[PDB]
Amino acid sequence: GCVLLHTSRKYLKLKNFKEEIRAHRDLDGFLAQASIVLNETATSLDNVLRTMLRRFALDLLMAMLFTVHLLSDTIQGVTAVRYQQSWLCIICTMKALQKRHVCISRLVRPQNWGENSCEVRFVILVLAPPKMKSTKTAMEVARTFATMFSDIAFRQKLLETRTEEEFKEALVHQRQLLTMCKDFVPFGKGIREDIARRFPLYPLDFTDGIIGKNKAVGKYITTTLFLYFACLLPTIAFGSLNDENTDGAIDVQKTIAGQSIGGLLYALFSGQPLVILLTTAPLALYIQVIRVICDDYDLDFNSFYAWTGLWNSFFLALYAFFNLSLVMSLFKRSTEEIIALFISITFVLDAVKGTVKIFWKYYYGHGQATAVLSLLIMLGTLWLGYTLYQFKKSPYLHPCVREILSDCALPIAVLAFSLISSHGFREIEMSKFRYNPSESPFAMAQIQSLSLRAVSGAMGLGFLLSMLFFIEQNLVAALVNAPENRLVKGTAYHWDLLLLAIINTGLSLFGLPWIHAAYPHSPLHVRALALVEERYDTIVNVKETRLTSLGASVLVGLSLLLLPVPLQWIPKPVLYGLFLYIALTSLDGNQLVQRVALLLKEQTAYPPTHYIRRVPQRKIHYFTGLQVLQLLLLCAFGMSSLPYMKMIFPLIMIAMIPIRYILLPRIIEAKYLDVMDA
């Protein structure tokens, strides 16, 4: 009965006692239940293995060990390639075991058990159940002992030991050996250097995936379509929100026009073009507050709105000119993810609040079919978009066709349910955003009309706006420029901030809504243009190009000609489903979200991530809990009914840095915190 024997040899990295705590935990567990065989007189591998098994407690266990050259799993040391015949590590997996059993047996005399086992003196048997954590599997536990025995000096010390207690002391002693401003002075250098880093690479932005090989034409078209829908609809909602707050001073037409002009300019004359500019709800809050201030006094809305925008741009220009973007590097992964998660929650709350608003107005008559259909459309749009989003991992279809279909998840879900609501349910009227003809012919707002005692108030709002703009712009840019994304071209933090002020001051003078780096869209824009290979998921490269951003801006601008059509065929629930879709898809890769899901996870399902290996689980869960506590602080201030607390929200984000670097070290060791950021 001839059979085929498949032998596979792979190099395993030496266990890092300095960094990995599992080695120390496994050594302590072994010391607690030591099974050490001293002066084993058996001259054969079979007898030694049977003796070690008897120390553990049989032919049933002995048989499963084999399939030295007949052993199923073994680990041996190699010297840079000479094998280490001095010691041998035998590994086996048994389904009938509940714990991990490690036995170390020392032979009286060297034994010639094979080509690479001619001088065996130490035999290490590691038995573990198949169902165990990836950090404490049979291979991992053996690597802890293999690394210690890989030292020739340590093996010599073991041979000198005479008693079991001294043998343990050598193991403990070996473990100990293994275990053991100037910037801002040049004000202009930040702006100058960023231009110098980006200007030579400008032509490559328009020909990165168009000219030459690896033509990613389908990716660019899909990403532009994804950006077009993901940007036009929120601006429509924000434009309507401004319309009902400013009583027609700022409408859908101006909001979309500002987004198109600002996006087009940013896509052309800014480094790192993957950042997407969009108006946000906090910006709408400032516009609402400005209207309230202008209502209380005898002040023109456009004049006051322009002046605070001028001060906002002026302070942002100073921030770029003083190279203040460097201090934003203190926002490590610990703080960025919390702020990242908070913004995703806001989009979820906006959809929930909008659904309640529809139910309150229609279902309770402050009719019922509209509210019920609104819930169905919102849930259906989220389901269809998310199902298509996850379709990329499916084995179904041609890889190219599947990638195109999956990357078109948002455009297809919006269009499909827009037809369902508008055409399949014509008899049921649906809530839609208001549309009105042109009212303000893009005036200059008459900045000189406003007098003293009011520009100073605008300066205060402008300074507060600058704090919001400075933090948000750098946070999203840092997320785009995260080390996980390759982006070999470079970063243009200082130049982008200066251009953002230049874009904003133009919008403020014409009364257009302000726009800055929007958190959900930009990484999704990077994620859409990125190439991911299963291993877990790793981004090989990102197609850095201005075509997607520029193309989306043009399409949004062209939508102004046919503006009523989106405002009629696309109801609010479709937008609410879009908000749910982008919020959920933006959490794919969030460090805090994964650890939150980890809390609720069976131990055996814990992935072998870097932070789990280096940081104790107890400390990780404490860090996760503290981050959730910080998240609740953001929710209390950022999503409150009082407008003032929401306006001072950037101060809360600033206050997170002292908590991270002063308060958190007092609770959790600073070394563990640094690993989480890394």
Ligand X SMILES: CCCCC/C=C/C/C=C/C/C=C\C/C=C\CCCC(=O)O[C@H](COC(=O)CCCCCCCCCCCCCCCCC)COP(=O)(O)O[C@@H]1[C@H](O)[C@H](O)[C@@H](OP(=O)(O)O)[C@H](OP(=O)(O)O)[C@H]1O
Q: Phi and psi at residue 101, in whole multiples of 5°?
A: -115, 125
Q: Phi and psi at residue 109, in whole multiples of 5°?
A: -130, 155
User: Nearest distance from residue 621's CB to ligand X, in Å?
Assistant: 4
The residues that touch its own copies, with contacts defined as CB under 8 A, are 1-14, 67, 69-81, 83-84, 114-116, 139, 143, 146-147, 150-151, 363, 367-369, 372-373, 375-376, 379-380, 383, 395-399, 425, 427-428, 597, 600-602, 604-605
| Partner from its own copies, ligand X, none binding residue 410, C-beta < 5-8 Å depending on class | none
Beta-carbon contacts of 364 under 8 Å, excluding residues fewer than 6 positions away, are none
Compute the distance between CA of residue 52 and CA of residue 36 in angstroms, rounded to an integer.
9
Q: Does 25 help bind ligand X (rule: CB under 6 A)?
A: yes
Q: Does 376 help bind ligand X (rule: CB under 6 A)?
A: no
Q: Single out the residue of 153, 618, 641, 644 in contact with ligand X (rule: CB under 6 A).
A: 618
The breaks in the chain (C to N more than 2.5 Å) occur after: 57, 67, 80, 180, 366, 535
**CB-based contact 645:637 (threshold 8 Å):** yes
* Token pair 């094998």: residue: 83
Q: Which stretch binds ligand X (CB under 6 A): 50-58, 82-90, 558-566, 621-629?
A: 621-629
| Partner from its own copies, ligand X, none binding residue 572, C-beta < 5-8 Å depending on class | none
Compute the distance between CA of residue 386 and CA of residue 405 in angstroms, rounded to an integer.
12
Q: Does 599 help bind ligand X (rule: CB under 6 A)?
A: yes
| Residue 75 vs 542, nearer CB to its own copies | 75
User: Nearest distance from residue 629's CB to ligand X, in Å?
Assistant: 8
The size of the interface with ligand X (CB under 6 A), counted in residues, is 13
Q: What Cα–Cα distance (Å) separates residue 664 from each residue in 175, 335, 612?
A: 30, 12, 18
Q: Single out the residue of 265, 555, 628, 648 in contact with ligand X (rule: CB under 6 A).
A: 628
Helix 455-480 to helix 281-296 angle, to the nearest 10 degrees?
Answer: 180
Element of type H or E holding 92: strand 87-93
Q: Single out the residue of 327, 621, 645, 665 in contact with ligand X (rule: CB under 6 A).
A: 621
Compute the distance between CA of residue 255 and CA of residue 449 in angstroms, rounded to an integer.
24
Compute the distance between CA of residue 518 and CA of residue 280 in angstroms, rounded to an integer.
7
Contacts 24+ apart (CB under 8 A), 232-235: 232/256, 232/555, 232/556, 232/559, 232/566, 233/414, 233/566, 233/570, 233/574, 233/575, 233/578, 234/278, 234/279, 234/575, 234/578, 234/579, 235/259, 235/278, 235/279, 235/556
| Partner from ligand X, its own copies, none binding residue 618, C-beta < 5-8 Å depending on class | ligand X
| Residue 419 vs 444, nearer CB to its own copies | 419
Q: Single out the residue of 15, 136, 175, 595 in contact with ligand X (rule: CB under 6 A).
A: 136
**CB-based contact 264:550 (threshold 8 Å):** yes
| Residue 227 vs 634, nearer CB to ligand X | 634
Q: Phi and psi at residue 585, in whole multiples of 5°?
A: -70, -20
User: Nearest distance from residue 592's CB to its own copies, in Å?
Assistant: 17
Angle at 8 between CA 154 and CA 122, to 5 degrees: 25
User: Nearest distance from residue 116's CB to its own copies, in Å?
Assistant: 7
Q: Does 617 help bind ligand X (rule: CB under 6 A)?
A: yes
| Residue 136 vs 646, nearer CB to ligand X | 136
User: Nearest distance from residue 389's CB to its own copies, in Å?
Assistant: 16
Compute the distance between CA of residue 542 and CA of residue 527 in angstroms, rounded to an integer.
8
| Residue 35 vs 617, nearer CB to ligand X | 617
- Count how many residues are written for the chain: 678
| Partner from its own copies, ligand X, none binding residue 114, C-beta < 5-8 Å depending on class | its own copies
Compute the distance between CA of residue 240 and CA of residue 251 in angstroms, rounded to an integer.
6
| Partner from ligand X, its own copies, none binding residue 599, C-beta < 5-8 Å depending on class | ligand X
User: Nearest distance from residue 4's CB to ligand X, in Å?
Assistant: 21
| Residue 393 vs 610, nearer CB to its own copies | 393
User: Nearest distance from residue 359's CB to its own copies, in Å?
Assistant: 11
User: Nearest distance from residue 349's CB to ligand X, in Å?
Assistant: 15
User: Nearest distance from residue 623's CB to ligand X, in Å?
Assistant: 9
Interacting residue ranges for ligand X, rule: CB under 6 A: 22, 25, 29, 133, 136, 596, 599, 617-618, 621, 624-625, 628
